[PDB]
C-alpha cells in the first residue's frame, strides 16, 4: 500500500505554496491505503514520551521545520488516542498515566492503576498480546533501548503489582504476593525468562546477576538460569550479528548494557533562563554509544530477520526508550537524539512492511511528556535551552511542569499512526486499549 | 458520508475492553468517508490555541476521560499539521507562530512573519480564500467570539503590516504605509468594510466608533460608514434572529460586544501551587454571557441559514476565540468553557453537512498553547489549579511557560480533522499553508 515518500515542504518557505507538504489530492492514495485483509505480522514501535511536541521538536532540530522524518512521518493513517490510567482505590480516571499503566493498556486491553504491570485494579492478571501471539504459534520479539525490566518491555511478559519488582530481592519486599519464595510467579526478570519470547534485546543485564530465591534454579543467578534453559545470550553487536536462528528451542536474549543502553547524542541539561543566559546548543554524538553496541535500528533489523523465518508470522514490539528518560532529565539533545534513533528503526520496519505487504506497522507513544517549544525570548519559570537547528535558526525548549527535577508526563492525547492491513483502526479518536483489540483482530488472535 | 456517532468508552472503564472507543473494524467506514467530488460549501472552525492538550483537558472536565465530544471528536479523518512562522529579517523558520501569522498561512497559502496580516515577509499582499470565494460568486461568512479586528477574522479581509492596526488612529502610527490618509488601503476595520463579506458576526464594536481620517467617509464614524454603505447592523440575539436575508446588496454586520464577547464559564486564575494549596474548582456558568448575547452555536446556525440561500455555495469561517485568551490568562474554566462552546458550533456545522452532502467541515487550531494536564501531586514552578471533572475525580492543569503572566503559544504540531469532500487532504502530516490549497481546490477556486 503506498508509504508517504516525501511530505517535506516542497519549495521555498518564503514563497506562495513553497511550504506545502502536499503535491496533489490525497483521496486516491488514502483509498489505496485501506485494507481489512489479515495482518500476518505486526511491528509496534513505541516512543516513550513521544507526544506530538516531542516529534515537532526533533523534526525542527534534525530535519528543519519544513523537514520530514522518513520513518515517523511516512505513515499514512493518523489519529489521536487517549491514555488515562485508573485510580486503584476509586476506579475513577487518573488523567496522567505512568509507563506501566499505559503499557498494560495496549498489551492487555484493560486499563489499570499507575505502577501495575499486566494486572487490573483488582490485581488480576490478564494475558498480553505477546503471550497470545506465542500461544497461536506466532514468533514474538521484544526490543528496547531501556532495561528489559522497565515498564514497556516488561509489560509484554510480566504480571506484577508494582513496576519496581525487577528481580528477586525487589519482588520479595515490594511484590510479596508475586515473590517466588512466597508461591508467586516471580519477578519481572523471572517471568520474562518463563515467558520465552523468541527474540528479546535490550539492556538491564544487572538484574540477571541476582540469584533465584526458590524454584528449580534456586541459588543460580538469573543469567545461569537463562543459559540452563536454552537461551542464546548475546552481549554485543558482533555476537548479535552471528545469530542465524532464534526460536523456542533456542530463544535469543541480548543484554547489551547493565542498565539502559547509551544515549545517541549528548548535550547540557536545560537550566533556569538557559535561553536568556546561555549560548545556543548544538548536540554532539555520544563517543560512548559505541561500534560494539547495536543501535535500535540494528536490533530491529536483526529481530525482523530472525522472526520472519517463522512462516506463521510474528509480533514485534520495539521501544525507543530514552526519549522519555531524557525528557524527564530536561536534556533536549538526549531526547531529540532518541527520537532520531526511533525514526531509523521505523524506517527499517517500513521497508520490510512495504515489500512483505501483510505487515501492520504502528508508531505511537505511551503518554505525552513535558517539553514545549516556546518563543526564543521566553522568560520561563522552569528549565530552558536554546538549540541550533538544521535550519540555522534557534529553537527554545521549556520544561516547566515540575520543580522536583524530573519533568513529568502529561495527560494530552497524542498521535498514533499506522501502515498496512487494519491501519484504518487508528484514525480518528481511539483509546490506548483499542490498540490491543486492533492488534488482536488484525492478527486473527482469539 | 458517515460521521462518528459515538466513540465514547463503550463500557466499564475498569473491565477488559470496557474503555474501548471502537466497536468493530473501521476500514469500511473510512472507505465511505473518502470522496474527491467538489465541495459546494466549506465551514472552517478554528479553536484559537486549541491544540491536542486543550481538547483532552476540556473532554476530561466536561465529558469525562472516556467521554466524547459530539462535535470535535466526531470528525472521521484526522491528521497533524505544522504551523511555524518566518523570521522577517532572515526568512528562516520562527518555530512559535502568533495568531496573525498562522491565520495568514491558512487564508492566503504563504507563510509570513509574526504580526503580519494578509501580507508576506516582503509586505506584499496576497488574496485570501474569502476574497477569492467572493470573486467566484460564493457567499462568505466570518464569525468569531473575539473582536472582529483580532487576527483570525481580520486575516480573511485585511492586509496590514501589523495586527495592531485595528482602526484609523492605530493604523496611522503603527501601519503608516497602510494608513488611509497616507494613500494606503486603510485599517483592519476599514478594509473589513471594503471587503463586504455577506455575514460578519462578532465583537469589537468599540473600533467602529472611530472616525475615518480620509476618503469618501472622512469624519464619519466607521459605524456610520457601515450604515451608509448598506450594511444591516445587528447588536443582539433578537435582531440577529430577525435577519431573513444577508447578501451583497444588504450585508450583515453583527457587533455583539465592545471588545470580545463574554466567556461561557467563570473560575479563578491558576496560582503558584494552586493544586497543593487550594481546593479543587468547579467552573460556574457566567451570569453575564446573557440571553441577549448569541452563542457561537447560534451565530454559526444563523450564518449557515443565510449563506445557504446562495445557490453557488459558501465559505464560512467560525472562530472559538477565548480558548486562547483564557489559556493566556491561565484560567482553566474560561479555556474549557470556550472549547465546549466551539464543540456546539461544530455540532451545528456537522448536522448541516450531513444532510447537505457536499460540505467540507474542517476543525483545527491556529497554534498550540501552554496548558498541560499534570499529575494531582505536581509541585510545579508555574501556575496550577485542580479541577473537579465530570468523572468526580481531580484533574490538575499547569501553565508553566512564562513568568510574564500571559502563558504563551507553543510550537507543537496539532490535530486537524475534517468531514466531507476532499477531507482526505488533512490526513497524515500536512502544513497550515496546505489548508489554503485544500480549500481552494475543494471549492474549485482559481
Ligand atoms: Zn516517563
Ligand atoms: Zn494567543
Would an 8 Å CB–CB cutoff place B6 in contact with chain A?
no
Q: Specify the resolution in Å.
A: 2.5
Task: Give me the torsion for CA of B26, B29, B30, B32, rounded to 10°.
Answer: 160
Where in A176-257 does DSSP place strands (E)? Answer: 199-203, 232-234, 252-255
Pick from B180, B186, B134, B128: nearest CA to B160: B186
CA distance A440 to B416: 29
Cell triple for B441: 481546490
β-partners of residue A419 are: A361
CB neighbourhood size of A353 (10 A): 24
CB atoms within 10 A of CB B287: 8
Q: What is the DSSP letter of A211?
A: B
Q: Which DSSP helix (H) or strand (E) runs through A272?
A: strand A271-272
Q: What grid cell was written down for A334?
A: 538526549
**What is the rounded distance in angstroms from the CA atom of residue A359 to the CA atom of residue A318?**
15
Q: Which among B131, B123, B218 is positioned nearest to B168, based on CA atoms?
A: B218
How far, in whole angstroms, is CA A219 from its chain's centroid?
33
A375 and chain B in contact, CB less than 8 A: yes
Cβ pair B418, A395 in contact under 8 A = no
DSSP 8-state assignment for residue A226:
H
Instruction: Give the rounded distance of the alpha carbon of B205 from its chain centre.
Output: 19
Q: Do B25 and A425 touch (CB under 8 A)?
A: yes
Pairing of strands B85-86, A85-86: unpaired
- Residues A196, A248: Cα–Cα separation, whole Å: 7
Q: Do A66 and B408 touch (CB under 8 A)?
A: no
DSSP label at residue A331 = -
Residues 177-236, chain A, touching B (beta carbon < 8 A): none
- Residue B14: which of A19, A120, A372 has the nearest Cβ? A120
Using a 10 angstrom Cβ sphere, with 0-12 exposed, 13-18 middle and 19 or more buried, the burial of residue A285 is: exposed
For the beta carbon of residue B134, count every other beta carbon within 10 angstroms: 20
As a whole number of angstroms, the distance between CA B294 and CA B292 comes to 6
State the Cα torsion A90-A95-A96-A100 to the nearest 10°: 50
User: SS in 3 state form for chain B?
Assistant: CCCCCCCCCCCCCCCCCCCCCCCCCCHHHHHCCCCCCCCCEEEEEEECCCCHHHHHHHHHHHCCCCCCCCCHHHCCEEEEEECCEECCCCCCEECCCCHHHHHHHHHHCCCCECCCECECCCCCECCCHHHHHHHCCCEEEEEEEEECCCHHHHCCCCCECCCCCCCHHHHHHHCCCCCHHHCCCCCHHHHHHHHCCCEEEEECCHHHHCEECCCCCECCEHHHHHHHCCCEEECCHHHHHHCCCCCCCCCEEEECCCCCCCCCEECCCCEECHHHHCCCECCEECHHHCCCCCCHHHHHHHHHHHHHCCCCCEEEEEEECHHHHHHHCCCHHHHHHHHHHHHHHHHHHHHHHHHHCCEEEEEEECCECCCEEECCCCCCCCEEEEEECCCCCEEEEEECCCCCCCCCCECCCEEEEEECCCHHHHCEEEEHHHHHHHHHHHHCCC
B25 vs A382: CB contact, 8 Å cut-off? no
Q: Where are the beta strands (DSSP E) in A96-162?
A: 139-147
* Bridging pattern class, strands B428-431 and B284-285: unpaired
Q: Please, which residues bridge with residue A246 across strands?
A: none
- The chain A residue lying nearest B54, using CA atoms, is A412
Decide if B438 and A22 are in contact by the 8 Å CB cutoff. Answer: yes
Quote the cell numbers at residue A274: 538557559
Q: Which ligand is nearest to the CA of A47?
A: 1
DSSP string, A37-66: SPPSEEEEEEETT--HHHHHHHHHHHT-TT
Contacts of B25 (CB under 8 A, 6+ apart): A36, A422, A424, A425, A441
Distance CA A170, CA A187 (A): 8
Return the ∠ at Cα B59 (arms to B68 and B399), rounded to 5°.
160
Which three cell numbers, joined as nine digits, stand for B16?
Answer: 477488559
- Other CB atoms within 10 Å distance of the CB of residue A284: 11
- What secondary structure letter does DSSP report for A270? P
Spatial contact of B345 and B242, defined as CB atoms under 8 Å apart: no
The answer to whether the Cβ–Cβ distance between A93 and B434 falls below 8 Å is: no
Q: Which B residues in the span 70-129 are in contact with A, Cβ-Cβ below 8 Å?
A: 73, 75-80, 82, 84, 86-87, 90-96, 105, 108-111, 120-121, 126
* C-alpha B95 to ligand 2 mean position (Å): 14
Distance between CA atoms of B13 and B221, rounded to whole angstroms?
Answer: 59
Pairing mode of beta strands B383-388, B394-399: antiparallel
Helix axes A52-62, A332-356, angle to 10 degrees: 90
CA distance B299 to B201: 7
Q: How many CB atoms sit inside 10 A of residue B23's CB?
A: 11
The DSSP call for residue A195 is H
Cα angle A120, A126, A128 (rounded to 5 degrees) comes to 120
- Classify each residue of B252-284 as buried b or exposed e, where b means 16 or more C-beta atoms within 10 Å of its C-beta: bbbbbbeebbbbbbbbebbeebbbeeeebbebe
Provide the β-strand partners of residue B383. Answer: B272, B399
Q: Which protein residues have a CB closer than 5 Å to ligand 1 (ion)?
A: A 324
Among A12, A30, A58, most B C-beta atoms within 10 A, so best to mutate, is A30
What CA–CA distance (Å, rounded) separates B136 from B443? 10
Shortest alpha-carbon distance between residue B254 and chain A (Å):
33
Place of cell 466531507: B420
Taking the mean position of all CA atoms in its chain, how far away is CA A347? 15
Burial of A159 (0-12, 13-18, 19+ CB in 10 A): buried
Would you call B429 and A52 a contact, using CB atoms and an 8 Å cutoff?
Answer: no
Rounded CA-CA distance A59/A369 in Å is: 16
Question: Are the beta carbons of B400 and A401 separated by less than 8 Å?
Answer: yes
- The span from the CA of B316 to the CA of B302, in Å, is 11
In whole angstroms, give the CA distance from residue A356 to residue A411. 36
B1-446 CATH: 3.40.720.10
C-beta separation of B146 from B46 below 8 A? no
Distance, in Å, from the CA atom of B363 to the CA atom of A80, rounded to the nearest integer, reads 14
Q: How far is the CA of A133 from the centre of ligand 2 (A)?
A: 48
User: How far is C-alpha A164 from the chain's CA centre?
Assistant: 19
| DSSP SS3 for A229 | coil
> Would you tell me how many other CB atoms lie within 10 Å of the CB of residue B307?
24
CA contacts within 13 A on the Cβ side of A79: 28
Query: How many CB atoms within 10 Å of residue A308?
Result: 17
Q: Report how far residue A182's alpha carbon sits from residue A166's, in angstroms, rounded to the nearest whole number.
A: 16
Region of A196 on the Ramachandran plot (φ > 0 left; ψ -120 to 50 alpha; else beta): left
Non-local (6+) Cβ contacts of B239 within 8 A are B254
**Could you state, in order of their start, the residue ranges of all structural domains in chain A?**
1-446
| Enclosing H/E stretch for A305 | helix A296-308
Put simply, whether B11 touches A (Cβ < 8 Å) is no
- CB atoms inside a 10 Å sphere around CB B62: 18
Q: Helix, strand or coil for residue A446? A: coil
3-state SS class at A277? helix
Question: Which A residues 122-161 touch B at CB under 8 Å?
Answer: 126
Q: Which residue of B has its CA nearest to A70?
A: B429
d(CA A402, CA A405): 6
Q: Is the Cβ–Cβ distance between B433 and B83 less than 8 Å?
A: no
Find, in chain A, the residue whose alpha carbon is nearest to that of B58: A412
For residue A299, give the 3-state DSSP assignment: helix
Instruction: Pick the residue from chain B with its C-alpha nearest to A420.
Output: B27
A376: chain B residues, CB-CB within 8 Å: 94
Answer yes or no: are the C-beta atoms of A238 and A244 closer than 8 Å: no
Residues 383-422, chain B, touching A (beta carbon < 8 A): 389, 391-393, 395, 398, 400-404, 408-415, 417, 422
d(CA A418, CA A144) in angstroms, rounded, equals 20
What are the beta bridge partners of residue B387? B281, B395
Q: Work out the angle between the directed axes of helices A332-356 and A296-308 (0-180°, nearest 10).
A: 20
Q: How many CA atoms lie within 13 A of A217 on its CB side?
A: 19
- The greatest distance separating any two alpha carbons of chain A, rounded to the nearest whole angstrom, comes to 71
Mention every residue, 6+ apart, whose C-beta is less than 8 A from residue B113.
B85, B86, B87, B88, B94, B101, B121
Cβ contacts of B297 within 8 Å, gap of 6 or more: B341, B344, B345, B347, B348
Contact flag A403-B379 (C-beta cutoff 8 Å):
yes
Helix (H, G, I), strand (E, B) or coil at A373: strand
Element housing A431 (H / E):
strand A428-431
B372-374 and A428-431: which strand pairing?
A: unpaired
- Spatial CB neighbours of A407, under 8 Å, sequence gap ≥ 6: A327, A328, A329, A330, A369, A370, A371, A382, A383, A399, A400, A401
A90 contacts B389? CB cut-off 8 A: no
Q: What is the DSSP letter of A22?
A: -
DSSP state of A119: B
Any A CB within 8 A of B271 CB? no
In angstroms, how far is CA A309 from the centroid of its own chain? 24
A-proximal residues of B, 44-63, CB under 8 Å: 51-53, 55-57, 60
Q: What residues does A275 pair with on adjacent strands?
A: none
Is A349 strand, coil or helix? Answer: helix
Residue with cell 529481530: A303
- From B9's Cα to the closest Cα of chain A, the distance in A is 8
- Spatial distance between the Cα atoms of A432 and B22, rounded to a whole number of angstroms: 11
On chain A, the residues whose CB falls within 8 A of the CB of B124 are none
Ligand nearest to the CA of B335: 2
Active-site residue (options: B33, B35, B53, B99) = B99
What gap in Å lies between CA B198 and CA B303, rounded to an integer? 9
Q: How many helices and strands in chain A, by DSSP H and E?
A: 14, 18
Q: How buried is residue A125: exposed, middle or buried, by Cβ count under 10 Å (0-12/13-18/19+)?
A: middle
Question: Quick check: B65 and A93 CB within 8 A?
Answer: yes
What are residue A82's DSSP bridge partners?
Answer: A431
H/E segment holding residue A433:
helix A432-443
Q: How far is residue A341 from each of residues A49, A69, A189, A321, A408, measured CA to CA in Å?
A: 14, 11, 26, 10, 22
Q: Which ligand is nearest to the CA of B328?
A: 2
Active site residue B99: yes
Task: Compute, in angstroms, the gap from residue A370 CA to the centroid of ligand 1.
Answer: 10
Which residues contact residue B399 at a Cβ distance below 8 angstroms, ignoring those fewer than 6 apart?
B270, B327, B330, B370, B371, B372, B382, B383, B384, B407
Check: CB of residue B51 under 8 Å from CB of residue B367.
yes
Q: Give the angle B372-B373-B378 at the CA atoms, nearest 5°.
A: 100
Alpha-carbon distance of B247 to B138, in angstroms, equals: 10
A280 touches chain B (CB under 8 A): no
Would you say A378 and A270 are in contact if contact means Cβ atoms under 8 Å apart?
no
The secondary structure element, H or E, covering residue A10 is none
Report d(CA B336, CA B389) in Å as an integer. Answer: 11
Q: Which residue has the cell 467552573?
A: B283
The technique is X-ray
Strand A383-388 to strand A271-272: parallel, antiparallel, or no bridges (unpaired)?
antiparallel
Amino acid at each position: 500500500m503506498p508509504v508517504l515518500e516525501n511530505r517535506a515542504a516542497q519549495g521555498d518557505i518564503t514563497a506562495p505554496g513553497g511550504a506545502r507538504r502536499l503535491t496533489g489530492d490525497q483521496t486516491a492514495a488514502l483509498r489505496d491505503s485501506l485494507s481489512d485483509k489479515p495482518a500476518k505480522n505486526i511491528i509496534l514501535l513505541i516512543g516513550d514520551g513521544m507526544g506530538d511536541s516531542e516529534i515537532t521538536a526533533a523534526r525542527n532540530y534534525a530535519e528543519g521545520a519544513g523537514g520530514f522524518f522518513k520513518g515517523i512521518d511516512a505513515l499514512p493513517l493518523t489519529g489521536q488516542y487517549t491514555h488515562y490510567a485508573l485510580n486503584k482505590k476509586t476506579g475513577k480516571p487518573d488523567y496522567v498515566t505512568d509507563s506501566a499503566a499505559s503499557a498494560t493498556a495496549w498489551s492487555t486491553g484493560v486499563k489499570t492503576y499507575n505502577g501495575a504491570l499486566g494486572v487490573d485494579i483488582h490485581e488480576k492478571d490478564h494475558p498480553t498480546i505477546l503471550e497470545m501471539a506465542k500461544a497461536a504459534g506466532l514468533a514474538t520479539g521484544n526490543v528496547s533501548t531501556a532495561e528489559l525490566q522497565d515498564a514497556t518491555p516488561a509489560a509484554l511478559v510480566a504480571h506484577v503489582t508494582s513496576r519496581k519488582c525487577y528481580g528477586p530481592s525487589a519482588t520479595s519486599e515490594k511484590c510479596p504476593g508475586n515473590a517466588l519464595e512466597k508461591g508467586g510467579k516471580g519477578s519481572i526478570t523471572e517471568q520474562l525468562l518463563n515467558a520465552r519470547a523468541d527474540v528479546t534485546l535490550g539492556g538491564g543485564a544487572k538484574t540477571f546477576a541476582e540469584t533465584a530465591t526458590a524454584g528449580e534454579w534456586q541459588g543460580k543467578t538469573l543469567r545461569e538460569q537463562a543459559e540452563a534453559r536454552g537461551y542464546q545470550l548475546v552481549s554485543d553487536a558482533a555476537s548479535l550479528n552471528s545469530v542465524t536462528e532464534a526460536n523456542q528451542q533456542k530463544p535469543l536474549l541480548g543484554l547489551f548494557a547493565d542498565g539502559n543502553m547509551p544515549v545517541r547524542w549528548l548535550g547540557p541539561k536545560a537550566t533556569y533562563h538557559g535561553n536568556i543566559d546561555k549560548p545556543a546548543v548544538t548536540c554532539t554524538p555520544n563517543p560512548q554509544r559505541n561500534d560494539s553496541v547495536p543501535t535500535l535500528a540494528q536490533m530491529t533489523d536483526k529481530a525482523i530477520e530472525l522472526l520472519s523465518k517463522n512462516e506463521k508470522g510474528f509480533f514485534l514490539q520495539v521501544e525507543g526508550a530514552s526519549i522519555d528518560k531524557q525528557d524527564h532529565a530536561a536534556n533536549p539533545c538526549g531526547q531529540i537524539g532518541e527520537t532520531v534513533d526511533l525514526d531509523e528503526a521505523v524506517q527499517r520496519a517500513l521497508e520490510f512492511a512495504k515489500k512483505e505487504g501483510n505487515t501492520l506497522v504502528i508508531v505511537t507513544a505511551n503518554h505525552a511528556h513535558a517539553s514545549q517549544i516556546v518563543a526564543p525570548d521566553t522568560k520561563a519559570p522552569g528549565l530552558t535551552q536554546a538549540l541550533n537547528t538544521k535550519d540555522g535558526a534557534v529553537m527554545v525548549m521549556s520544561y516547566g511542569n515540575s520543580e522536583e527535577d524530573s519533568q513529568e508526563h502529561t495527560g494530552s492525547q497524542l498521535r498514533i499512526a499506522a501502515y498496512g492491513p487494519h491501519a484504518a483502526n487508528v484514525v480518528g479518536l481511539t483509546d490506548q486499549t483499542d490498540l490491543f483489540y486492533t492488534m488482536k483482530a488484525a492478527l486473527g488472535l482469539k
